[PDB]
Symmetry: C2
Subunit: 1022 residues, 2 copies
């Protein structure tokens, strides 16, 4: 009897939505209109049958102040949570102009229409409510079509972002205008109106920003608990709206909009397994909200609205549908000159798509339902719902159905030739794979008698899309084929975790843009915008770093004055005193009690005494040097005011005390601002490194590919020249970014290193799990310890102080792990310094010693650049012959210099563990061996990272143990030569030094003359 | 003002649970007790502060009939949805005895205690409510501990299943006994009580079964719509409980229990991406329910319960906690003799774990809250909540905390040596991988200056666990090492999709069992239980197949009599008439109206006329043969009754009409029963094929492994003998299963073939996506078309009629794709037949022709067996020399025979497309080449499937084009010899025919003498 009947209607709507969504899947009509018809049916039968009324009443006639608080957060957050925020930011101004100003004109024009055309004789407030609910649009279908058809980035996000902002502001306007119709207030003082505007417009986004930054902070500290992450997201979403709208009178919708957008941006703080869950979770909740709303409309529209219609109302409906359509187009075209300059710009065809795709829906209907409940017996609620519902139906029946054909007409739905080629190739390879698999199964004793006619038909996959003049387009083939290769390399790096998605999309966008521009190649100056740091943050860092420059100053009191515990406790003491500060003012306001005032003022005296005591300790610690710092001068003012107020009207105390301790807390606040600024720079700088990395590695790989793909050498040379001229510019730019922000660069580099180690570490877990040497449960146990570390990686400090040179030597590849060897060369070492533009070494110079870059950049000339950590001379010291390249510093340089004579002693003394010479040779071997193997298979599916790891498993042969090296391929897969020359066993031909040994080679005869020591590199097969 | 305040409390409890679950993570105390303390705090402050009362009232004092309808479905379904059902079924009786009978004794004993010990003077009804809520247990923590510690399968599922059943029945008992206290009824007739019992006990599970089978049916037909799958699951879950409890008065909890269990069993009908979502989704909902309930308890217990406590109540609490503990142990021990026989049996230590781990919780508390609301001012609600809450606290404070130490004491928490070894090896390999990765990064120009001291520390992974007498244990090493290898192979097959999880767990369970038994090896007779079909289903199939044996009978009326459209429409006509049948009875019952009765009786006359017309058509079609079938005899009785009722008290009509059309519908019902029976056999048979496959492939792989791992040949021979003696028995059993159920076997084989093709087809999609030749969106588009087909695979008919022999030839590997060649040999072919035990061919026989098995089994003797589809003679016809093995039929056999003379003509005539001889050689090459490569790398991570595919890419060399074959390794990775012999180019040594060419071999010189045609197989490198 007392059961929750709402479970029936909610679950019933679930079934009805499933049915409508399953039947009308391949049909053009959207499933939502079917749901409206079903709700209307429920309404007519429920109008006579009493039994079903009881199971529909509690939801069909649900209160509006609950409709808003429950559904709108779901719809708005889901719309925000589904955004491609990065794109939305790269078009923010274009959206704001159309969504905000376009909304005002669209609604007002719609309002004047409703005042003048209709016979309802509405006033401007009601007409503005009408226009507000008319302007709200939910283009969930059109955006899907564009997403499927391609070329969606510059249009789908615009309509999606415009939709989000338009609903967000429309609710704001609707809330504003509902109150001057149903909740009229008489005060209407102008000053409060400005204050009223500030709350909804300004405080809302700020409330959401604060809640978001708090939320991500905790989420970044939750490890191995998915339920809590999901639960935190839910509670934050609903509390943000509820608190903002109900307790703060702040705009809930905008707070959620910002909160969803901020969280979407900060998804890295969320565990990936929860991220995928949340999207599908909020999508499901939005689906339920949509399905409910349409059915409630279908019920009430039939019970209450359609019974009060008049004959002419249909005339207004058609006219209104036409009006909003031309209104939207006029608005879009009117702003079009402005948009052409701001953002990507609108073509006339794209403008029509936005105009034609302005679908209405749940948000408009939800606000109409609010009016229906609020109007009661007034006709307005009926006709608001009538026209809102009708326009939703027409847009769904006409615009949602003809949009595909219109896209065909405009030539936008056409699949580009590259995509047709990709699909044809993919289908062909898949078809061959099945044929191979089919023959294998027919040879299986278990499956020999399966009905292959059924099998082949069931598994088949089908294509869903079923001279100067010569140079003028031969170059186009070179451009497109190079650009296509670049796109491939970017996808490679992304799939192996070397590259973030944001950098990948930036690179791909630039490649696509360059392809369309007829004579264009991808341009570094366009890429430079990614890593060029905006000056505000560096200026703020430089400025704030001065405010804590304690170096002007920097017997137990002297120790206590500097002890961190004392400072932290004093700061805390000030923090607690803030509660009395506000409490006294609030108590005075409420009193205007004495028992409370006396307690507070006694507490004030106690705090004055405490402040005197701590200041006395500080003064005793520093003596006359105490007052050197302006911070301590205000600390003296603290005692002045404390003594004055101890001796002794209320305002004279309030005004001084309100400033004292806020200012004294600013000192502890500044470092956090420094950290935040470092974080912003770290984010921008990290993306710059990724993009510069992507382009550099992309060019390095592509240069191997194009060398054999393009037919004409003249075309080849022009393209390769571009590649190097861009690569060196990027390298220089990225090297210089380090010097401006050393610590942040170190943080970036460390984070990449750990992330790369963990990724490959994770891969091994799946290797043995796939190999069965480790079970499912235990492998999962290890994988979690990896995952938590990855999350801990995010919380790494935004700035790491650069290690001193004495620590750099310890971490060198050929020095690490041998303390005695580290000490020997460290003791023998000396540190040099060089001025700007100075030459360090030059072509033909004797190799008298070795260099390590501890600071600065150096240009070489086969031009290249190097920076901190890079060793120079690792070959000359070994080959013992003149230096191979010039070394010029592009900035002031510091280097650790080891004289060749001392190093030679270290070389011929440190050989117990793997030989020092062997290690130095190994570093050289990998360096110059990588390009050879990359050339040999860059056109295949490998990346240079795996070539390095492929080589990393290898080692140098101990040639001293044999006069010759004979090949084998069972336990050996690749071999390269580095130094010296060998004689072929069969043909007696010589093989040159930096050459890969062809697989037709067997056995190599070396010789032990003193001119050179031949060096050879092998990688043993798995 | 009118906002939904409940959003605050729900979201507030979310935050409080997050806090408590985050702080008390590493502590021993569970987080739930912390939540209770927090709720108590909220209660005391809310008792004075009015503001927070308003935000706690609407939930803290929520109605009970909503508490049950909302939370219990979530808790019960989640507990059911989380089960390992297969294990739960393999222990169902053991759980039922303990959970059902143990519950009755545990509660009654608890009730007598409450009647006699306590001073409350309860009557048996109230005391039974007490015992019911006391017996409910939620061992969510203990099961987690066992899951982590290992050896959990035979104990965790028992406590989990016992818990599920105990809560399910406890609610049933609580519902029963609440009604005789708060809703007393006076009728109490015995006959209704039995009817009342039937509804709750019998109809509930049936209601859930019907809803489940309907649900999975639709879910199996939903393609590419995840939201609808999730939504359907939700609505089905809540409607099942709501309809069952409210409309049918049926036991909702048990219906949901069955529904959750059935759905969990039928998870294959659900898309995998939705399956993973649902578990985390229902887990989250259960988490919310738990967190809410504890806080509502903490609130009300402080407001209303604790204010009415007496001093002695604590004495009863302690005594009660002791009593239920010894009661549970006495029950477990008392049934222990029975359990030792039924199921796995209980050790004394395992019994204590069950006794000690009997934690109470939300379910007990939820039912106590119901009493608190219902008791009103009566003390009983206070003390019910007091003792329930206290026992929950004590079990959580004591049992949940000491359980780990007790497990240590009993020696159950000890990590077995094999797991320690696996963890040490896994950690070591991971540690080496990071070291390799670290050195690679130090050579990177971008990351050379990262603080490696930070990196190495952050990425490090640490071990979490930180003669006759010789023969008597050398054999143990052989046993364990063989058994360990078997376990590895099973994991291999599972990870590549060749093996289902159920078969994998069965095999692993048997391996573990055999390991513990001192002298045991895995035994086929133990495996036989998997594929031995229970006779009920074959008997039912055989019986029902007779009832539709139309062959006793099987001018337009003759055609119409057999047309399917006429039969379907007639059956539909009968289906519609059922509505009048029930409608007349219901109308008569309600009347006891005439305007309705006349319409129904007129409809009865019309339906009588229609039935006469259709029968007239049938009789005209068959003439005097019409009455030959008993179905048509009752069809004549239909006309008899129709004419009698047309001419003409109400009972005389009801009784006849109630039978006529139900019986006439049974005819259309029988085929569906046939299909269902086929489905049950298909499921059991499919698992048998998988397990037999797993053991056969496992033994084949292991025999390659152990041949070099065990040191003693005598041990080796004994182990290998076991392997073959099991393999041949399994092969024979699986071959014979086919003959008993040909069509179902064909369905199984076809389903495996398609699933294997799609899996490898899916793999290619990720290959190019990882290689970047296909983009993220388009690759995803193709992958969906693959996924939908996989779901369509489930709906494939359970039985496929075996194709006739004329279709078998077309699908042979070396015949397919060449119609003219198919026709030639098909025309030349002849079909033979052989009797049981007949010899087909024998050792030393001349190869006069070739055989193909179209029916039956054949034994060979290197013993082996073959069955349908297997060709025999594929070498003798080629080598043209005597036959190599005996061929004896183990059952009646049919074979397609091609005489060698005709085939030779086909061989030397069909050579335009790839040579017929080349194809026959290829089939032989793969067959005998696979074992060689398996031997060469079985100890590595490969499976024989990939060896076949590794070979499938290869081909036979065209030796006719060269006197010699010189090796290369850049575009070639493996080569094998099949026929003939070659001479080494370097050493001039001969290499034998069925031998892999060692990687030290270069160039092979063949000769063209007429004795043999040498054959060589190559696989080109990627």
């Amino acid at each position: 009897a007392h059961a929750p009947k709402v479970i029936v209607f909610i679950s019933g709507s679930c079934l009805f939505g499933a049915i409508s969504r399953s039947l009308f899947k391949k049909l053009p009509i959207p499933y939502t209109v079917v749901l409206l018809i079903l709700g209307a049916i429920l309404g007519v039968v429920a109008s006579n049958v009493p039994l079903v009324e009881e199971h529909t009443r509690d939801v069909a006639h649900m209160d509006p102040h609950v409709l808003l608080q429950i559904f709108l957060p779901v719809l708005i957050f889901e719309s925000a949570f589904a955004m491609d925020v990065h794109t939305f930011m790269r078009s923010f101004s274009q959206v704001c102009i159309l969504a905000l100003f376009g909304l005002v004109v669209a609604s007002v024009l719609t309002a004047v229409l409703a005042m003048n055309l209709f016979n309802y004789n509405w006033n401007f407030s009601e007409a503005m409510m009408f226009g507000a609910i008319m302007s709200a649009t939910d283009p969930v279908a059109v955006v899907a079509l564009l997403k499927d058809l391609g070329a969606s980035k510059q249009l789908g996000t615009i309509i999606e972002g415009e939709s989000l902002l338009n609903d967000g502001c429309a609710i704001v306007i609707f809330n504003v205008f509902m109150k001057m119709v149903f909740f009229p207030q008489l005060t209407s003082t102008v000053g409060q109106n400005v204050l009223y505007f500030l709350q909804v417009a300004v405080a809302g986004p700020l409330w959401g920003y604060a809640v978001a930054k708090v939320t991500v902070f905790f989420l970044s500290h939750i490890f191995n608990d998915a339920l809590v992450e999901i639960t935190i997201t839910l509670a934050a979403t609903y509390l943000t709206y509820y608190i903002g709208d109900i307790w703060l009178e702040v705009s809930g919708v905008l707070a959620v909009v910002v909160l969803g957008l901020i969280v979407n941006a900060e998804k890295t703080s969320i565990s990936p397994e929860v991220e995928v869950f949340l999207h599908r979770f909020w999508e499901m909740l939005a689906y339920l909200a949509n399905t409910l709303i349409f059915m409630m409309v279908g019920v009430v529209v039939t019970q209450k609205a359609l019974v009060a219609v008049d004959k002419m109302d249909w005339f207004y409906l058609i006219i209104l549908y036409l009006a909003i359509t031309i209104i939207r187009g006029m608005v879009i075209s009117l702003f079009s000159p402005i948009l052409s300059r701001i953002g990507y710009g609108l073509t006339w065809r794209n403008a029509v798509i936005m105009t034609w795709g302005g679908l209405r829906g749940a948000v408009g209907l939800a606000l109409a339902l609010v009016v229906e409940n609020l109007a009661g017996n007034d006709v307005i609620g009926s006709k608001f719902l009538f026209h809102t519902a009708g326009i939703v139906v027409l847009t769904l029946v006409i615009n949602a159905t003809t949009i595909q054909t219109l896209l065909r007409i405009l030539g936008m739905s056409d699949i580009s030739i590259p995509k047709r080629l990709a699909m044809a190739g993919a289908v062909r390879r898949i078809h061959e794979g099945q044929n191979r698999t089919l023959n294998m199964l027919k040879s299986d004793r278990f499956l020999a008698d399966a009905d292959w006619d059924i099998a082949t038909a069931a598994c088949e996959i089908s294509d869903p899309y079923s001279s100067p003049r010569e140079f003028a387009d031969m170059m186009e083939e070179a451009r497109l084929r190079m650009l296509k290769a670049e796109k491939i390399s970017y996808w490679k790096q992304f799939e192996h975790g070397m590259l973030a998605r944001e950098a990948l999309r930036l690179l791909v966008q630039h490649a696509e843009v360059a392809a369309d521009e007829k004579d264009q190649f991808i341009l570094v100056d366009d890429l430079k915008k990614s890593w060029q740091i905006k000056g505000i943050y560096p200026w703020l860092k430089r400025k704030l770093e001065d405010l804590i420059s304690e170096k002007k100053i920097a017997k137990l009191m002297y120790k206590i004055c500097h002890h961190m515990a004392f400072e932290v406790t004093i700061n805390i003491a000030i923090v607690l005193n803030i509660v009395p500060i506000i409490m006294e003012f609030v108590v005075q306001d409420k009193m205007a009690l004495q028992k409370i005032e006396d307690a507070l003022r006694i507490s004030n005296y106690v705090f004055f005494v405490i402040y005197a005591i701590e200041a006395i300790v500080k003064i005793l610690g520093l003596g006359r040097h105490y007052i050197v710092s302006h911070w301590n001068k205000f600390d003296a003012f603290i005692l002045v005011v404390a003594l004055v107020d101890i001796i002794i009207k209320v305002v004279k105390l309030f005004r001084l005390l309100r400033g004292l301790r806020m200012l004294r807390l600013t000192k502890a606040l500044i470092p956090k601002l420094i950290l935040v600024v470092n974080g912003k720079i770290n984010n921008q700088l990290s993306l710059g490194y990724d993009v510069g990395k992507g382009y550099i590695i992309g060019e390095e790989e592509v240069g191997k590919i194009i060398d054999r793909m393009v037919d004409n050498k003249k075309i080849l040379r022009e393209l390769k020249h571009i590649s190097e001229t861009g690569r060196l510019q990027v390298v220089k730019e990225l090297g210089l970014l380090q010097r401006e922000h050393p610590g942040i660069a170190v943080s970036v580099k460390t984070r990449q290193a750990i992330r790369t180690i963990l990724n490959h570490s994770r891969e091994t877990i799946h290797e043995l799990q796939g190999a069965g040497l480790l079970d499912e449960m235990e492998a999962h146990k290890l994988e979690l310890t990896v995952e938590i570390k990855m999350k801990r990686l995010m919380n790494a400090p935004s700035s790491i102080p650069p290690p001193p040179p004495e620590n750099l030597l310890k971490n060198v590849s050929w020095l690490a792990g041998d303390m005695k060897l580290i000490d020997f060369i460290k003791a023998r070492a000396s540190l040099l310094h060089f001025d700007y533009g100075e030459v360090i070494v030059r072509e033909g110079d004797e190799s008298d010693g070795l260099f390590l870059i501890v600071s600065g950049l150096v240009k070489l000339y086969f031009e290249d650049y190097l920076t901190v950590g890079n060793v120079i001379g690792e070959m000359g010291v070994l080959t013992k012959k003149p230096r191979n390249a010039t070394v010029t510093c592009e900035t002031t340089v510091q280097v650790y210099f080891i004289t060749a004579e001392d190093m030679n002693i270290a070389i011929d003394t440190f050989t117990l563990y793997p030989s020092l010479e062997y290690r130095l040779w190994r570093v050289v071997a990998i360096r110059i061996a990588t390009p050879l193997i990359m050339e040999q298979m860059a056109f295949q599916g490998w990346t240079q990272e795996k070539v390095k790891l492929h080589l990393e498993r290898g080692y140098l042969v101990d040639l001293a143990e044999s006069h010759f090296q004979f090949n084998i391929d069972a336990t050996l897969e690749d071999v390269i030569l580095i130094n010296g020359t060998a004689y072929n066993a069969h043909t007696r031909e010589e093989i040159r030094s930096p050459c890969l040994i062809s697989r037709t080679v067997h056995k190599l005869t070396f010789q032990y003359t003193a001119t050179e020591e031949p060096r050879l590199f092998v990688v043993r097969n798995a």
